[PDB]
Paper text:
SC27 potently neutralizes ancestral and contemporary SARS-CoV-2 VOC and many antigenically distinct zoonotic sarbecoviruses poised for human emergence. To aid our understanding of the ultra-potent and broad neutralizing capacity of SC27, its structure in complex with Omicron BA.1 trimeric S was determined by cryogenic electron microscopy at a global resolution of 2.6 Å. The progenitor of bNAb SC27 was first recognized as a circulating IgG induced by the Pfizer/BioNTech mRNA vaccine in a naive donor. The intrinsic binding affinity of SC27 Fab surpasses the apparent KD of all other human SARS-CoV-2 mAbs thus far reported, including former FDA-approved therapeutic antibodies.
The region near the RBD exhibited structural heterogeneity. S trimers were observed with either two or three SC27 Fabs bound, including a dimer-of-S-trimers interface mediated by the RBDs. Consistent with its robust in vitro neutralization and in vivo protection, SC27 binding clashes with ACE2 binding to the RBD and completely ablates the ACE2-S (D614G) interaction when tested by competition binding biolayer interferometry. Interestingly, several residues within the SC27 S epitope have been mutated between the Wuhan-Hu-1 and BA.1 strains, suggesting that SC27 may possess some degree of structural plasticity since it is able to neutralize both with high potency. The potential for SC27 structural flexibility may be accommodated, in part, by the cooperative “bispecific” involvement of both its VH and VL domains binding to two distinct epitopic regions that are both highly conserved across diverse SARS-CoV-2 variants, SARS-CoV 2003, and bat and pangolin CoVs. Notably, most epitope residues with a large buried surface area when bound by SC27 are highly conserved. Additionally, key epitope residues with side chains that form hydrogen bonds with SC27 show minimal natural variation.
Residue numbers in the entry:
A (entry chain C), B (entry chain R): 335 to 515, 522 to 526
C (entry chain B), D (entry chain L): 1 to 9, 11 to 27, 27A, 27B, 27C, 28 to 95, 95A, 95B, ...
E (entry chain A), F (entry chain H): 2 to 35, 35A, 35B, 36 to 82, 82A, 82B, 82C, 83 to 100, ...
Write the structure that this text describes.
Amino acid sequence: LCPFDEVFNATRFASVYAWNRKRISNCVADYSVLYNLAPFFTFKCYGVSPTKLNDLCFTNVYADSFVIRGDEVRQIAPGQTGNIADYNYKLPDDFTGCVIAWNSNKLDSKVSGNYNYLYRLFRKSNLKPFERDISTEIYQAGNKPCNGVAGFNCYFPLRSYSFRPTYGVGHQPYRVVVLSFATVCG
Amino acid sequence: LCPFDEVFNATRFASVYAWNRKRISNCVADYSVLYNLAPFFTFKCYGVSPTKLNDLCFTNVYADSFVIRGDEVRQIAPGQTGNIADYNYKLPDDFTGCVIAWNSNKLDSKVSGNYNYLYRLFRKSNLKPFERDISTEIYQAGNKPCNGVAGFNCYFPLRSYSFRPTYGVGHQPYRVVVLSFATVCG
Amino acid sequence: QSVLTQPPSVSGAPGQRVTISCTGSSSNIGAGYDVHWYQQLPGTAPKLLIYDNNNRPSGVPDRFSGSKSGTSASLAITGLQAEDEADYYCQSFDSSSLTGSRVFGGGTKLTVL
Amino acid sequence: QSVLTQPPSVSGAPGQRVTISCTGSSSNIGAGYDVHWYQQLPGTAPKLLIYDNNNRPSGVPDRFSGSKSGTSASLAITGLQAEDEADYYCQSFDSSSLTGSRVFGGGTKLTVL
Amino acid sequence: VTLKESGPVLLKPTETLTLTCTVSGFSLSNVGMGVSWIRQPPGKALEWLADIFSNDEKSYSTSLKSRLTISRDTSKSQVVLSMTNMDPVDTATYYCARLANYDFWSGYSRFSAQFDNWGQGTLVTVSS
Amino acid sequence: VTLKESGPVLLKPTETLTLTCTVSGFSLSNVGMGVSWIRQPPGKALEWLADIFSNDEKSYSTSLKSRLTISRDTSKSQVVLSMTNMDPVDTATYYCARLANYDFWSGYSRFSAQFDNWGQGTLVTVSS
Ligand SMILES: *[C@@H]1O[C@H](CO)[C@@H](O)[C@H](O)[C@H]1NC(C)=O
Ligand SMILES: *[C@@H]1O[C@H](CO)[C@@H](O)[C@H](O)[C@H]1NC(C)=O
């Protein structure tokens, strides 16, 4: 078929500031069985209809995967504004694909706190759609030049999630898969 | 008299991982009025008594100042274990001085979150008494090595406080002055 | 008591605009969660009136409109007829719990003078 | 209900050891705050019994002792005399509020068989 | 789409309530929709109680989580709610509602799901 | 050290209660100690109510912060507690205690302060 188990059933998901990007091509994809049979927490499509994705074909399909906060799933959508939207993962206002999310508190959460997941907290400007920043350098707050080390008005851009099983659904980790849409047909 | 306004009334305090250290010498210090009239949240002396500090005097006096979490003042004491004790500021088991702390939610707290203050979260081993770690470099978790950048099992050692006025007394900032004890006679 | 707060009741003359507000906490409405509005005529089960911020189901007249701003949301009725005399309930998803929660407003009684 | 919880009643024979437990939340006892124990004889005001973990005020007999471990603390009485038949209350500071709070236990009734 | 609750009942205090909701027009195994329970005391505001979905994840009111218990069975499309230690204050009209997303042609989202369909409700009275 | 509350008082429901503590043996201006109020329903557990210190810093029970109000007067050494909208369930013995640190020769800490001294208490009765 097409490798969706490599995306939805991967052992480790990337951080939102370093979200993964896999090109999907040269396969037949049965989106209908995925939509009706797989019980996700969220399956929202903006440019297309989930129940009729099989009759269209596209030149390529991109699947982006990352882990975000529970109430932070709201801003994975066109036209949204927030820390994830501006600094981590901006989605185009004319987005045509689908957004899929499911709770992963059983895998990405630890009693001591899972510090493996980070999110960009400070940036000079908002991201363009579908652009990511891997580089982490000290961010200048205020007006004093920075010497390249954390200090008074100099911050480390990446703030870490600290997922714990008792955080509540608001802060529990959520694994998000974003599909962006004639080598791929249903 | 003695420079105690420069320590207790300083405009800005240092982070706990980079606590200040001011030598107090060649002065006459009247600790009695400081204890009796100044309304601190905490004034605890271990090797001495606060009401009879004036009749004693010492070769030198050290004053250490830093900002910590509200419930994190518990471990500023001899024989204590905790994040500050093991990784940020270790106090000797035979400590003879006094510890002074007061709430500073009116100064160190911001609506957007005061990322101005950091605390060491990861380290290879517990600190020696009265020793501090200024250098920040990525901490290796697990057994895979570190290339010098943050990643899956590589963490930035410094975790930032996010003081906000609605955090509660447990998380509100506390300014702590630690005094260590014949050039300074009462 | 209810997590979301509404004025107990509102009044207005026929043909005059009437607005009903809803306020939330740092969670739910403050966390970006959508606000839905329901209408409960006397002796009747509640009926969905606004299924998302400024989104209106079929069969609901266009004189009903809504908006969201920060930790607050409001329902606006342009006209005012005889049938606009029911209770209007604010509703949103609250994320300050282990499995999540859904919180209703206090309920606003609309009366036509 | 009280934030700290205690067994409602404990019993023991004269001259035998008796232990009363007290557990807390992630805050208060779980946050490292000290635990204090009080004694309330019938028709009398409470009296301080253990002013800090394993610390004892003057006049309180040596047979009373206390300890703290994680989110729980306990009071241990080595002997058991006639006067050890009062209510014992667990107490600690709770920091899960803007100005702080002080939380009492549910109270344990001790009886001598 | 039609949801119907069981008939009204009268219970003694400290008893255990059991309510059954029968659904039609949709299958409980559909991932995009779930079933929830809401109660309305006479002359007061609505109160959400419980929530169940297509694959047996369950949600309860935080203050009433211990007393409540919900279950489903896809064989005859029924959802059962049970409340233990019923108090006289708990007398109210109990509604069975479908937690489904309007604008379903755009998919579904459990955060923004709303009670788009409601039952006629049943009246539960707790008294001596 | 001696703390004495006001005499017992009977009040109608919804009324406003006012209780006063007179302290001796120590000054409220001392930074090392404060005064707190605790209530105990007949045959029930203790409940901390309010707290006031030397520099007029004040703390209240979270669930009763709206109804409570405390004040002090150093010139005549009394602390006044006032509760609004009294309910019949609020009838209880109200205790007045000193929030001071035992082991005072080592200093003081407001986190570890304990009710080292207690008053004899007063009985407040709320009924029609
Ligand atoms: C992932 O694993 C589950 C395990 O039950 C399986 O049902 C599913 O088909 C797999 N693939 C996807 C895309 O979920
Ligand atoms: C700091 O400033 C306050 C302002 O009232 C003053 O009372 C105090 O003496 C100063 N010095 C110290 C050490 O607190």
